[PDB]
Amino acid sequence: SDFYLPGDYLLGGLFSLHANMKGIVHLNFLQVPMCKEYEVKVIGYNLMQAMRFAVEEINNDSSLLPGVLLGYEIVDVCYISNNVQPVLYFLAHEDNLLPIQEDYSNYSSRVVAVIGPDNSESVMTVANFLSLFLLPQITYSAISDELRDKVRFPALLRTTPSADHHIEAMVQLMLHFRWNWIIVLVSNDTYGRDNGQLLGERVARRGICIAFQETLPTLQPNQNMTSEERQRLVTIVDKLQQSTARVVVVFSPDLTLYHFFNEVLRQNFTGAVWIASESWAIDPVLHNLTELRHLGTFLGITIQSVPIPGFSEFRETCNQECDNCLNATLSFNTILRLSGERVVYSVYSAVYAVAHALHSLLGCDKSTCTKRVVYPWQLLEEIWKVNFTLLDHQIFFDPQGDVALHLEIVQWQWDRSQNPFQSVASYYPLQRQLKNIQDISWHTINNTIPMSMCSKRCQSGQKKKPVGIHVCCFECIDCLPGTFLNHTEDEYECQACPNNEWSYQSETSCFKRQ
Amino acid sequence: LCLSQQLRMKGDYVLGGLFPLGEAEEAGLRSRTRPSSPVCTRFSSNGLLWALAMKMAVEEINNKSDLLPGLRLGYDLFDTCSEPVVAMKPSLMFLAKAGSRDIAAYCNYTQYQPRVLAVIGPHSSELAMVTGKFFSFFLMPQVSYGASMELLSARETFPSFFRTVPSDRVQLTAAAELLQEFGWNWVAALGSDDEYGRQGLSIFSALAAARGICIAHEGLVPLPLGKVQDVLHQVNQSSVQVVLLFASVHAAHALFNYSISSRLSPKVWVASEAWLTSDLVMGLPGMAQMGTVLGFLQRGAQLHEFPQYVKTHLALATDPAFCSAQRCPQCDCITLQNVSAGLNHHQTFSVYAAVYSVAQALHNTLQCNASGCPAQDPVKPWQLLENMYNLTFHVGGLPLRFDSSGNVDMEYDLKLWVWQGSVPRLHDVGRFNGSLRTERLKIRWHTSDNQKPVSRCSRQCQEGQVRRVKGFHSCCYDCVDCEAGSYRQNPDDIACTFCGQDEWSPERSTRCFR
């Protein structure tokens, strides 16, 4: 079968092949939730194929694990649903029973490591259990900052930069183009609330102002829209249309945005800059709504593209199946081909990290490995210590368990003759700087940079007066005669001229006349 | 004593229980390197008192012929040590197979049977959610004597959770009722930067908007001082006389230590249960100078016989013959002098009620005739859960009722710190049960004249007045007068329009004249 490959040591693989934001978490008639009826997602199957390709390479390459077969067992975890049972299935002692003990130092679990879930909530839920056994867990796409507390999650490591760096990239991009007045949309779930709070803090500290924050309804493309949801979407898009802000930052699952963008199309809306968060920045499905060309320009945050060799051709016990996955991926294969492996590198590096850590744990030379029983805590102990080059990049684990990889800002392109996600800038998390911004193309008449700002910059001799709550909004008022704006000291008030000098209106100088 | 040995006894049906019997030492916050549970040697009295309350409740349920006639009810208590790592091990142990020490990973459970019927849940909210995922996946009843966290109301994610204490929303709606009934439509809100306070601020902000209460300022204070200085500075800048402080005890102590450092200005503080009842904050000197402190506390009956019960059992627990009848260390060394301070603790009732509710729910599920239950195969947890959603049960008197939300209908008393000497006397000045009854003449304010202190804003103005918004949600206006020599051309607009050189008008005028 596709989801299982025997070996001497086994890796547990968790990916979300099917998803539904309103899925049932509890048992149905005392049978474990079955995900086949939820919507299939192409990119999750792509990442699962990435794991399988990585293990194929490791089994072929005798230089890394000579004579040791590396196997895997993969289970579908469907957003929240089916969180619990796969963990017990990984931990059980080969007859699906897990004994309760006061000590697990000598307990041989069925898998030695878990390539963990893609969702923050699933990651935390699984880590709660795997923390007891100290079974090493590596997650490739869960960005929430909560995961940095290793007293809280000792067993957990990541191969993608934390949410802080995503927010930093967005903020520095907005600063570079000197935007000042932005809209924020969130999807009424914990991902949206997390990232919205973090963005609020950073933006407030950096002098940009969030003009507007709003929550989307949790609509679904297969489901018919109710009148109330329609009214809500109408309200949201009307609010945006009548407002002056045109930078729109969207934190949402891709499933939620289909109806939102359709409604935006109904409203004849145009002219925005859509800052797409990682959760949808590279979705093939949304990209194929070719009418989006008229809604402005789309810039997304993602992890740096690294071209994996050979993986392009490779892409050509309940809840271990997917029927529609291959039929779905077959259609998008061309678009996927053009899009350089991005998150695929996170999965690839996770598997290679476990491979190297196991290779070191066995003390293995590149001739033979002295096979022995491996207990997960020792493999975690060795995983913390690896440092090696992988495909012209390099991975080693920080004190917080993260790995440093370049972030990338990408513009959506619709020509279909070349890469649909063009690189336009790159953010280095070690330097905490956005770097090497290239030629973005704009919807504007002559590619002059668009902007949205609360108030235009005042003329010389005009002091500020705050308009309201936001520091970013100010009226301009000329200084009165006999007073001047000492711009080197203050911006909000005009100072009086010396007792022997005077000034005109809207003047910074003083002169010796009555 | 021989008292740890009493934390278990047999029965035809078994109740599991989680309490903070022990705690970690500060040096005991060890970084684990082998997978074994932290050994929480350090004792804590509150947990033991709650466990004794559970023992008393089960003893009564066995004694009464009116409930579960012909069956013996047993219990099995475990320490949580207030951490997920420790709490999760007995959580797994509870759901192990009947008559065995193993947990099973089957894909269907139609005739599976765990060793416990239901679990008396943990006290703190973090443990409540962590164990709620697990227990609600299996559809096992969980009944918590604490965990006011509002997030637990969600039946999409916590189907089987119940509690015998009101959730945060009841207290916050009572606070909104207080503000509305006293007429304080202009306030500031502060919370502790933990999930408790950070969720409370969201709930209260939405409620305040719904009832027309305007929030001048929002902020969070850290738990263990730049942000504290910033928060109090902004509060003073906001020109507000009423401040809500929905903060954990340590955060409140930090903020009021800063206030002790300098009492910048006095204000009416709306407290929360935790601060309102915790000694280390109540002991701070001269707090009458802060302004009056108000807050709502829920009222339930005492366990009148409980102190005599504890006296009796701590006397009995050392008889050399009775000892013939170590999950908690140091439990066996305790003496009544270290326990006495907590014998009157209000939360014991919530433990007692919980047990009774479960017992009642079982009695209904078995359909027991009062003279004896009918013969049946063992009741499974998911059978009991179906009956428990619509359950009315007496607790000594005062019959309570669960509903679909899993909460109980319970009423609140408005407590005022009437300061006398260095001691605040807790004075009742009203009740809330969904509507607020206030005995206003009894409260004496901090302001010398003992008239009601004023914290309000306008939302209406003669049309000749400006409309510049203020407040965190722009829910207030300034009403500044339109200038003489100008006319108010636009209703509800900001500006006014000026008149000719020979053209004159009053202030607030809509017209000008020759």
Ligand SMILES: COC(=O)[C@H](Cc1ccccc1)NC(=O)[C@H](CC(=O)O)NCCCc1ccc(OC)c(O)c1
């Ligand atoms: C609660 O957060 C969310 O619901 C969202 C969206 C989501 C919903 C259902 C299933 C997966 C994702 N999460 C994220 O975007 C997480 C960040 C985090 O979750 O911390 N980064 C994933 C980037 C690569 C990715 C992998 C799998 C994909 O589909 C199977 C997919 O679309 C994108």
